[PDB]
Symmetry: D3
Subunit: 135 residues, 6 copies
């Protein structure tokens, strides 16, 4: 139950600079669960503008990654983003942080789906979110 | 009333590829409001990935614009970071050629709407912290 | 008579970073005119270099957008245009006047009119306006070459 | 003596990547009011990805912009004895051959008119000593 | 013991797209050793061209990451790469791999310096090499 | 002239594409002598120069090495993709800055099943700036 970047490409149409997932560590047909890894390095173009004197990762991008993680799970049952409720960002994600991303389905309401995602670095909670995504 | 992209650079520390506001057209301290503009063009790198064969502005970049709009109004109240983001409604596809007008009303927290040619494309509630 | 970016691509081979037209607002084969639109934003790579202390669009990228709009017009008319006869590639530029700095947040409205045809060489006269103020005008020669 | 490397060129003009389109000055002369500059053309410039995906050729406007930067440099070199330079006018541009990766673009510019904050040049770009493009350029010195 | 990316920018002039180290995990001037990390993701420009159809990290950039951890260890005791030898590439390195870089200073004859280096993914060696750096300014 | 290959020809031979396409053209080659001569122009408009170094642009020596290896892989292709099995004896002598033209010469010295060994040098203005010994595998 391993999907590397190449498998992920057959699944989503996202590509550089908006493929924000490196691999799928594990997936659950049954549990409607997924876990993804996005590695975070100084050598990604956003870190130049956000921010010049302090590389931090855009929250919205973590969310986009959770979203992309959510979107894949879907395709395993495209899937564009319809909404994103309750989103809270506890910790700065920097270059070096491996980013581990868990996303679970909770609502299947007629060609729409909803998910809860949490994002962690060394186990800690850096971000959680409710993601709403359809098609 | 207005603030050009060089004014935005003295207020916020953001830069390329994450300066997502071209200019501030209005604001008002009294009223706790701001209107900003984000021009959208095929010549922005994110469209090469999102997606080949159909370039559409990703939802989350709409929010980030909204957030910078917000965090400038904020800075006029006297840098901010994005704590909470809530009630995010992605109506329509934003495409190369659309002009994005950004309304942010403070109520720190805020209500923001993003428009193309009158029409709402996005709305969201935005908590935020230094 | 509107053509979105996806439409431009069927017509012009240009892709990023040298696709400098968002959409065609209007065309007329009968009138040999075209209106195009280029949105100018600070999220464009060239604004980092021209200039780092003060982003303003390069004169020559304005011209290039004029040239692209003229080549779409060119294509749309190739049955008319080339009655008596593969991409349109710029062969001359002549009456270029740059009147105003074009800055991020300007919408760039581009008018091009084809005024001369001569055995594969096309001449158009273009102007570009920001908030209906004249920002640049040019005479473009394109050759329908390989 | 009459060379200026890319770092010298950085102190003369504010242009940076991706609109720094000169690698070095080869010769100049305030006395003859001419300058010889060089831009190397390589596949590993980004504009080649879009112009064109299946046939990389250097856009004509960029050759012109190379010539105007060389002209602006000549202007700056001549400033003391004429009194930033911005491109006000372009005329008579002829694009003569396609320029492709691996071509060394040698650029010659000669200042012909001084007319009150407005300068005016003739300029040619060459590849292997043959002309790929010519132009008259009109820069205006303004802050 | 640790140095974040910010600390790294004070020691080395390298910047994007040639900053090839995220952080120093540890060092030791006594043993003359350094361990670095470099995260490998699909979001990195060089993966577009190497290769479209199969993104794999260029050997020569793995080496450049080695030479950069080395250069740090150097100033912890600019360093310009003057020699490379016995470079062996074992294993391809792809998006998702975390890339641990260990360098160890071997010789320090005058102004020329020399290191032994290794790069690893999940513990196994993916590349090794001997590097010669001169401290030319 | 019968022995030139432009960038669109290099593309048919090697999968490397931007930003890791590092040869502009092949200038000469002998299938009999086991040689190739290629060129790579170097210019300020290359993105690595914004990082290497911000206040002083000079070509990473690893990139000179990568240009050599591509040259070497084209020659291997022409004698017959080749991957970079080994790099030995790399001398980085002179710094390479915008405005220089890298002339690259590769010489196939030995072979040992798929693994192949070349001697390779890099030239600016007839002077050597970099030399090395390369082991590419695969055929």
């Amino acid at each position: 139950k391993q999907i590397d970047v190449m498998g992920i490409r057959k699944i989503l149409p996202h590509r550089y600079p908006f493929a924000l997932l490196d691999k799928i560590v594990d997936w659950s047909v049954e549990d409607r669960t997924i876990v993804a890894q996005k590695n975070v390095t100084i050598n990604e173009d956003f870190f130049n503008g956000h921010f010049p004197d302090f590389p931090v990762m855009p929250g919205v991008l973590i969310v986009e990654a959770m979203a992309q993680a959510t979107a894949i799970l879907g395709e395993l049952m495209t899937f564009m983003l319809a909404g994103i409720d309750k989103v809270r960002v506890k910790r700065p994600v920097v270059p070096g942080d491996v980013l581990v991303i868990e996303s679970r389905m909770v609502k299947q309401k007629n060609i729409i789906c909803t998910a809860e995602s949490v994002a962690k670095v060394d186990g800690q909670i850096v971000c959680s979110a409710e993601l709403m995504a359809a098609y």
